[PDB]
């Protein structure tokens, strides 16, 4: 599907709500505790990647194809939110534009 094959990829990160049981009966029972307190959780996360990139030196004379926002007027701008508040991606953008000698 494309990508970087890794022997030792980034570690999976797993999270759970710790169970909080509801009021236990007064008499003892060895069976599992069936009833819990309904709860959920929320909070912010952040991810910081450091990328290394190969600089481009090409002596070709004439200009190259490059990615350009669509040249047309439109009811909704490209890669932007619409009236209802929904973010819309117009195109899958490949990485291959700049030419290189074979």
């Amino acid at each position: 599907m494309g990508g970087f094959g890794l022997k030792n990829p980034p570690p999976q990160i797993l999270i759970k709500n710790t169970p909080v049981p509801a009021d236990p009966p007064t008499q003892f029972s060895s069976q599992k505790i069936n009833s819990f307190i309904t709860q959920y959780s929320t909070g912010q996360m952040t991810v910081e990647i450091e990328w290394e990139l190969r600089k481009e030196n090409s002596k070709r004379w004439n200009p190259e194809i490059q990615y350009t926002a669509n040249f047309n007027n439109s009811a909704n701008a490209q890669f932007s939110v619409n009236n209802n508040g929904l973010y819309i991606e117009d195109r899958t953008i490949g990485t291959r534009y700049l030419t290189h000698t074979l």
Binding site: W61, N62, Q66
Partner: protein
């Protein structure tokens, strides 16, 4: 030095650094003898919107003033997509490998 040794090398390229940027160009030129070794008066005729008085000179000159002399269409693309502004700083000019021929 001498008849048999070149006085320079060919430099044309573009060096892209972070802040400065340095463009090199070199060309081959041909200089005739203008006005057969004479200064001359030049002037118009009659009354009109185009009338002039001046002199023509037996001298040539080097004009590099236009942009595309210094930049290739790829460098120009590379310039204008990535940047909000440009201004000149220094320039360096050189003549070499002069050769004079008689007809």
């Amino acid at each position: 030095d001498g008849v048999g040794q070149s006085s320079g090398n060919w430099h044309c390229d573009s060096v892209w650094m972070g802040d400065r940027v340095l463009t090199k160009s070199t060309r081959t030129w041909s200089l005739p003898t203008y006005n057969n070794h004479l200064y001359k008066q030049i002037n118009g005729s009659g009354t009109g919107d185009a009338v002039y008085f001046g002199y023509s000179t037996p001298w040539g000159y080097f004009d590099f003033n236009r942009f595309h002399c210094h930049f290739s269409p790829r460098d120009w693309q590379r310039l204008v997509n990535n940047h909000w502004g440009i201004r000149p700083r220094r320039l360096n000019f050189k003549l070499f490998n002069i050769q004079v021929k008689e007809v």
